Design a protein around this ligand. Structure first.
Ligand SMILES: Nc1nc2c(ncn2[C@@H]2O[C@H](COP(=O)(O)OP(=O)(O)O)[C@@H](O)[C@H]2O)c(=O)[nH]1
Ligand SMILES: *C/C=C(\C)CC/C=C(\C)CC/C=C(\C)CCC=C(C)C
Ligand SMILES: [Mg+2]
Lengths: 197, 442
């Protein structure tokens, strides 16, 4: 159906922090304990109503390529926003955010929006990354911050809606126009379309 | 905590290995794909401009100088090895079946031009252009038309459509004779449509030439303009897309990971696994490019010179085309091999606004390789920068059935990827024992 804007979002962060579960909670409203999938999530499409506008989101997941840090230029192509995730119970995953920010600086556009998410906030006894420390770091890297739980749903919908709003409100008029339904055709060919011998 | 056992280990992330990795993972095989390099693509990677200077120049220029002349490094995705995609070729068939179209967008190439006595002419892409083209005279076009009508009405199962010809018994020269085509038309068909790099095909069974000519016609018919497609952001998007497909279906990837040692089964010469800084991994077979097993490969005897040129203007006499192929038939220069030029620009997101990339290549036949390319350099007008390299083509000494070491061929001098997908299908047959059968991904 119709939409006002179409945005491309990415999830990134260390293996095991809950990126795939966050996407599945937002897209399918489901959560599987001890999640393990033979076939990894590719991307999900969700249309949301945002402050009076219909926003279609194509949200990409890593397919496990972050395990040994093997994600390069292709994943970042055409991205409008990137959600960087860490696990509040894993200090190294928070330390890893610095490296992911360097990757984003290298491959994504300088105007890409970023959001920091500290996941697994339901594990209150095992938290090691303090909210204030993560908030200070997010402020220092120009990005909003939310702690989430794909397991119990805490802030999951709000994390994705926050990123959709960041993009919609920050884009220049020219960049926002490029995401409208009228400008969906970029002049590329459809390999599945019927021939024009 | 890294699994030690796999069904298949793949070394090198060139496009041939990445397509095989994706297909084997889709088949349900547990694949480990390792590259000693810090990026995807192998020898046919697309690189940034700073990477291009590091690889081909003695004293790379500063970032300040590079950006004032060429803009942001991120706007550049320069192919090391030029290739277009036939619009109806096997790679498009694999892309649609695997949905790797989700990770790579494609735009048409504006046209293909053929060189004749110092000038270039656009090869027709529709009937109006065919009527206008001065490449053939009026009576020869009528004969050419009958020949193309036979290419399209020919049905293998219906002898009444063969017009007395047999694609396996008759040579292509005999096919040309039946239609009364002269030498200039044979050159046009052989070099501009079948894309043979010399005239050896004239004395060989017609079948392969017929298939190549039909592929060209079907490819032009898909979207018009030319028989080619080219990926947005460069050829490097292709191995990355197939690597993502493999990862989605269970594949494991390691980059910047040298192979400390290849392990073999005691006294048998058969592959057993690899030792790396992350541990030792085992599998009953390995798929790899020639750089991982140089002793198991041999030179084909051909060396290819590739000159990557940056222009600050469109190529002359191309109607300001945003992309094109130029074919220089070897008969026009007294050569043994054709010279090709592959041109793309900011319309395909491979360079900054205003620049064009023109990559010239040919098989070397003299002591002064740079001089062999002069006729092609002259077609480009002023050249801002040239990055030159020469590569030797290798092939496996054996097919891998005896040592379980299945090697790919070096990327060749052909202007498009059909020979690479032929290598993928052959390697797949050698590895699995049966031909590749594509399934439509859901
Ligand atoms: N307690 C808890 N476990 C979670 C949460 N999100 C994910 N997990 C678990 O952590 C593991 C890794 O999750 P996964 O989504 O595959 O994250 P990925 O590697 O970042 O994509 C699985 O065992 C999940 O069930 C969460 O919010 N809370
Ligand atoms: C299916 C292929 C189409 C519609 C066009 C491609 C044809 C080529 C490249 C042949 C050029 C033929 C010439 C110049 C001869 C004259 C033939 C006619 C006017 C049919
Ligand atoms: Mg995941």
């Amino acid at each position: 159906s119709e939409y006002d804007y179409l945005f491309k979002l990415l999830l990134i962060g260390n293996s095991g922090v809950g990126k795939s579960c966050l996407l599945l909670r937002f897209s399918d409203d489901t959560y599987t304990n001890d999640y393990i999938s033979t076939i990894g999530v590719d991307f999900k499409i969700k249309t949301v109503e945002l402050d009076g506008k219909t926003v279609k989101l194509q949200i990409w997941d890593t397919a496990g390529q972050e395990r040994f840090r093997t994600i390069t230029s292709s994943y970042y192509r055409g991205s409008h926003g990137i959600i960087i995730v860490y696990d509040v119970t894993d200090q190294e995953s928070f330390n890893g955010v610095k490296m992911w920010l360097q990757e984003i600086d290298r491959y994504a556009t300088s105007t890409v929006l970023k959001l920091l998410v500290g996941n697994k906030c339901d594990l209150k006894d095992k938290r090691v990354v303090e909210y204030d420390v993560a908030k200070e770091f997010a402020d220092a890297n120009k990005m909003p911050f939310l702690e989430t739980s794909a397991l119990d749903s805490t802030n999951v919908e709000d994390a994705f809606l926050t990123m959709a709003r960041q993009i919609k409100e920050s884009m220049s008029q020219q960049n926002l126009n490029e995401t409208t339904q009228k400008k969906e055709d970029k002049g590329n060919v459809n390999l599945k379309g019927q021939s024009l011998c | 905590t890294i699994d030690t056992d796999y069904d298949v280990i793949v070394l090198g992330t060139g496009i041939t290995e990445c397509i095989l990795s994706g297909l084997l993972s889709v088949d349900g095989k547990k694949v480990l794909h390792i590259d000693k390099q810090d990026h995807y693509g192998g020898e046919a990677a697309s690189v940034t401009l700073s990477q291009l200077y590091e690889k081909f120049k003695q004293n790379p220029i500063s970032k300040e100088e590079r950006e004032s002349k060429f803009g942001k490094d991120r706007d550049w995705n320069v192919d090391l090895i030029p290739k277009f995609l036939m619009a109806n070729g096997e790679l498009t068939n694999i892309l649609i079946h695997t949905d790797v179209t989700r990770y790579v967008d494609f735009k048409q190439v504006s046209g293909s031009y053929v060189f004749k006595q110092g000038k270039i002419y656009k090869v027709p892409a529709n009937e109006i252009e065919a009527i206008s083209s001065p490449l053939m005279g009026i009576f020869e076009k009528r004969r050419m038309k009958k020949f193309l009508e036979w290419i399209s009405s020919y049905k293998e199962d219906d002898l009444s459509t063969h017009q007395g010809l047999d694609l396996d018994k008759n040579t292509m020269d005999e096919v040309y004779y039946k239609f009364g085509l002269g030498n200039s038309t044979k050159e046009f068909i052989g070099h501009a449509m079948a894309l043979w790099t010399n005239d050896d095909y004239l004395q060989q069974p017609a079948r392969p030439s017929f298939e190549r000519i039909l592929l060209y016609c079907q490819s032009v018919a898909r979207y018009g303009k030319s028989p080619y497609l080219y990926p947005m952001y460069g050829l490097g998007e292709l191995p990355q897309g197939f690597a993502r497909l493999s990862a989605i279906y269970g594949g494991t990837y390691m980059l910047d990971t040298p192979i400390d040692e290849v392990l073999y089964k005691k006294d048998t010469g058969k592959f057993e696994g690899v030792k790396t800084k992350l541990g030792t991994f085992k599998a009953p077979l390995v798929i790899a490019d020639p750089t991982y097993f140089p002793e198991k490969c041999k030179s084909t005897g051909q060396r290819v010179i590739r000159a990557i040129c940056i222009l600050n203007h469109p190529v002359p006499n191309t109607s300001n085309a945003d992309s094109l192929q130029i074919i220089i038939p070897q008969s026009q220069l007294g050569r043994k091999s054709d010279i090709y030029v592959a041109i793309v620009s900011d319309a395909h997101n491979v360079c900054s606004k205003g620049h064009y990339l023109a990559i010239i290549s040919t098989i070397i036949e003299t002591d002064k390789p740079h001089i062999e390319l002069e006729p092609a350099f002259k077609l480009l007008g002023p050249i801002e920068e040239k990055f030159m390299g020469i590569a030797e083509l290798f092939e496996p000494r054996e097919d891998g059935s005896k040592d379980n070491i299945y090697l790919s061929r070096s990327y060749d001098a052909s202007s498009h990827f059909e020979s690479m997908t032929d290598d993928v299908k052959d390697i797949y047959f050698r590895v699995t024992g049966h031909p590749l059968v594509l399934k439509q991904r859901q």
